[PDB]
């Protein structure tokens, strides 16, 4: 489901999020915004095989699986199924994979394209957090 | 390889326009934002106001009707005009890169007096 | 216009010693708040951001908790590099204020 950026800015600050890898909790929502919209049950096509799942759109080819897109190396370690539901620990679980070094969150497009480099905070404001 | 490094006039007449430049390099002028801060000789650190990577400004409630900023991706500079400078504008400003809510990496400071 | 009251605006203690120096906001800046150190000649230096989270290379010497306007930055063990004045900044919203700093130096 389509959640709020307050009412999803909490769980993803309970679940970790908050200044990972020196990333401000703005950045998390800002993220989902774009990428999918606040919407749970967000799936997407790409150019080949691969179909991004969820609220964070993780790729069905390097991250989780689908069993049906060609090269499969699910890092991730998990079903793309699990990643379409109305709770994001799966996802943010597989979220916290991606960002490695402490400049991992250029992999979301969306983040990268329109929220680098704005007040991203501004998506975490007026949250009771 | 994070630089920064502001260059500007040291004198300047008052009633005059006080603009100073901020050249970069090792980072995405569209990815970070850029603050300006000034501190007068002896005195404390005084924002200025900055640019966001999207290309915004934000200016101090004070120096707001006579800051002006400007980003150059050409030359990978930013620029700070401080319109009609009275003797108070006598500091050393600085340029700031800003990383996701702090000032991380710092110009080294060019001083600008007004005379008279 | 959330302001910045930073305080004491200089202090002296030996080496060996733990000094804390405190920024209360005049609003709440949500855990935004940032310190910074600065020797004489040259540009401040990151030191905390996000209220505790240390820069990278700085000693652990240093720390930082507070929550909602209070905030406070402590050095466990005064050491004759840690001579400087040291800032705070909110970084919530739009504009930011920095404390005055406090000077910190060695008794004696």
């Known amino acids: 489901k389509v959640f709020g950026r307050c009412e999803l800015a909490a769980a993803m600050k309970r679940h970790g999020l908050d200044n990972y890898r020196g990333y401000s909790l703005g950045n998390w929502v800002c993220a989902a915004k774009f990428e999918s919209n606040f919407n749970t049950q967000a799936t997407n096509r790409n150019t080949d095989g691969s179909t991004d799942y969820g609220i964070l759109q993780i790729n069905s080819r390097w991250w989780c699986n689908d069993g049906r897109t060609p090269g499969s190396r699910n890092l991730c370690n998990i079903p793309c199924s699990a990643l379409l539901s109305s709770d994001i620990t799966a996802s943010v679980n597989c979220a916290k994979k991606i960002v490695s070094d402490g400049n991992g969150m250029n992999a979301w497009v969306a983040w990268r394209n329109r929220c680098k480099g704005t007040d991203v905070q501004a998506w975490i404001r007026g949250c009771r957090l | 390889q994070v630089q920064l490094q502001e260059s500007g006039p040291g004198l300047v007449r008052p009633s005059q326009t006080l603009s100073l430049t901020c050249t970069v390099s090792g980072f995405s002028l569209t990815g970070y934002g850029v603050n300006w801060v000034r501190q007068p000789p002896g005195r404390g650190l005084e924002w200025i106001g900055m640019i966001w990577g999207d290309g915004n400004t934000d200016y101090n409630s004070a120096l707001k009707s006579r800051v002006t900023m400007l980003k150059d991706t050409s030359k990978n500079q930013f620029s700070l005009r401080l319109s009609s400078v009275t003797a108070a504008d006598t500091a050393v400003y600085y340029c700031?890169?800003?990383?996701?809510?702090?000032?991380?990496?710092w110009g080294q400071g060019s001083l600008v007096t007004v005379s008279s | 216009d959330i302001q910045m009251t930073q305080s004491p605006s200089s202090l002296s203690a030996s080496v060996g010693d733990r000094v804390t120096i405190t920024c209360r906001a005049s609003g709440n800046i949500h855990n935004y708040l940032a310190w910074y150190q600065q020797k004489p000649g040259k540009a401040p230096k990151l030191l905390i951001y996000?209220?505790?989270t240390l820069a990278d290379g700085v000693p652990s010497r240093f720390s930082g908790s507070g929550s909602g306007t209070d905030y406070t930055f402590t050095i466990s063990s005064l050491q004759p590099e840690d001579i400087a004045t040291y800032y705070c900044?909110?970084?919530?919203?739009?504009?930011?204020?920095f404390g005055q700093g406090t000077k910190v130096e060695i008794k004696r």
């Open positions: 700031a890169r800003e990383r996701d809510y702090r000032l991380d990496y």
């Open positions: 900044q909110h970084f919530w919203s739009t504009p930011r204020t």
């Open positions: 996000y209220t505790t």
